[PDB]
């Protein structure tokens, strides 16, 4: 009966958790790896604007904070 659907899920979940334990630190890399792409693409997004709006420098008092890498 419908348990037979749940069994599949139950297994697929278990078999996933196990995986994410072994793979943990590999995972941890690739997460942060993409956060450093994010923050960069983000930056370029704004850089694009100065250069598109004709300004040479980034406007006064702009440090362009890091949102994605926010921790603690």
Partner 1 sequence: QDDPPPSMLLLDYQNVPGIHKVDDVVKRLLSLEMANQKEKLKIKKMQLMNKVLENPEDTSSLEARIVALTVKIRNYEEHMQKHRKDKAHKRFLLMSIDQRKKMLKNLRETNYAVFEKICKELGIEYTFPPPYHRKAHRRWVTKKALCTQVFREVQKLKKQKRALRAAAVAAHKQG
Binding partner of 66, given partner 1, Mg ion, RNA, none, CB within 5-8 angstroms per partner class:
none
Q: Closest CB to partner 1 among 19 and 55?
A: 55
- Contact between 64 and 43 (Cβ < 8 Å): yes
Cα dihedral: 24, 31, 33, 59 (round 10): -150
CA–CA gap between residue 24 and residue 43 (Å, rounded): 29
Least distance from C-beta 72 to Mg ion, angstroms? 22
47 binds Mg ion (CB under 5 A): no
Contacts with RNA by CB under 7 A lie at 45, 48-49, 52-53
């Amino acid at each position: 009966k419908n348990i037979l659907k749940i069994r599949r899920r139950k297994m697929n979940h278990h078999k996933y958790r196990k995986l994410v334990k072994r793979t943990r630190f590999l995972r941890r890399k690739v997460r942060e790896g993409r956060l450093r792409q994010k923050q960069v693409k983000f930056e370029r997004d704004l850089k694009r604007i100065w250069q598109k709006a004709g300004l040479k420098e980034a406007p006064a008092g702009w440090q362009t904070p890091k949102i994605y890498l926010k921790n603690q």
